[PDB]
C-alpha cells in the first residue's frame, strides 16, 4: 500500500547517507551512485556536444524512437567501452529532460524502456565479459 512506499523512502535516504561516508546499501546502490557521478562528470565536460536535441533531432513522440535508435546505433557502431556506456546514459538523460521542457512528458517512460531494452539486449554481454558493473565502479565515481 503506502506501506511498501514508506519502506522504499526509508531505504532510499539511508542508501544516500551511507554512500556519503564510503559505504553502500547494496552492490546495486553502489552501481547507481557511481553511474550518477559518472553522468555529472561527463555532462560537465561535454554538454555542448549534445545540446538542443529537440531542435536538432526534430523530436516528437512519434519520431523520437527513430532518432534515439539512430544516435545510439552510431554511438556503439564499432564497439563498446565504459565511456560510451556513460555517454549513452547521459544522452538518454538529456533526451528526457528536454522532452519535458517541450511539454512532451509522455516520452520519459518510453525513453526509459528503450534505454533499458538496449542496455539489456546490447550492452549487458559486453559488461559481463569486461568485469561487470563492479569494474565500472572501480574505474568511475
Amino acid at each position: 500500500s503506502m506501506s511498501q512506499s514508506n519502506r522504499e523512502l526509508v531505504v532510499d535516504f539511508l542508501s544516500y547517507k551511507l554512500s556519503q561516508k564510503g559505504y553502500s546499501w547494496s552492490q546495486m546502490a553502489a552501481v547507481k551512485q557511481a553511474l550518477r557521478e559518472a553522468g555529472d562528470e561527463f555532462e560537465l565536460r561535454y554538454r555542448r556536444a549534445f545540446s538542443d536535441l529537440t531542435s536538432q533531432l526534430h523530436i516528437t513522440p512519434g519520431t523520437a524512437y527513430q532518432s534515439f535508435e539512430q544516435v545510439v546505433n552510431e554511438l556503439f557502431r564499432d564497439g563498446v567501452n565504459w565511456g560510451r556506456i556513460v555517454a549513452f546514459f547521459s544522452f538518454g538523460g538529456a533526451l528526457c529532460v528536454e522532452s519535458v521542457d517541450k511539454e512532451m512528458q509522455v516520452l520519459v517512460s518510453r525513453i526509459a524502456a528503450w534505454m533499458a531494452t538496449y542496455l539489456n539486449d546490447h550492452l549487458e554481454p559486453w559488461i559481463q565479459e569486461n568485469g561487470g558493473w563492479d569494474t565500472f565502479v572501480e574505474l568511475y565515481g
Binding site: 565536460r45 536535441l53 545510439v72 567501452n81 560510451r84 556513460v86 555517454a87 544522452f91
Partner: peptide
Amino acid sequence: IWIAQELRRXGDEXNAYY
C-alpha cells in the same frame, strides 16, 4: 556528419583517462 559521433569521441576520451 554530428551528435552521435562527437558522444562517441567525449566517450573515448572519458575510456582513455578513466
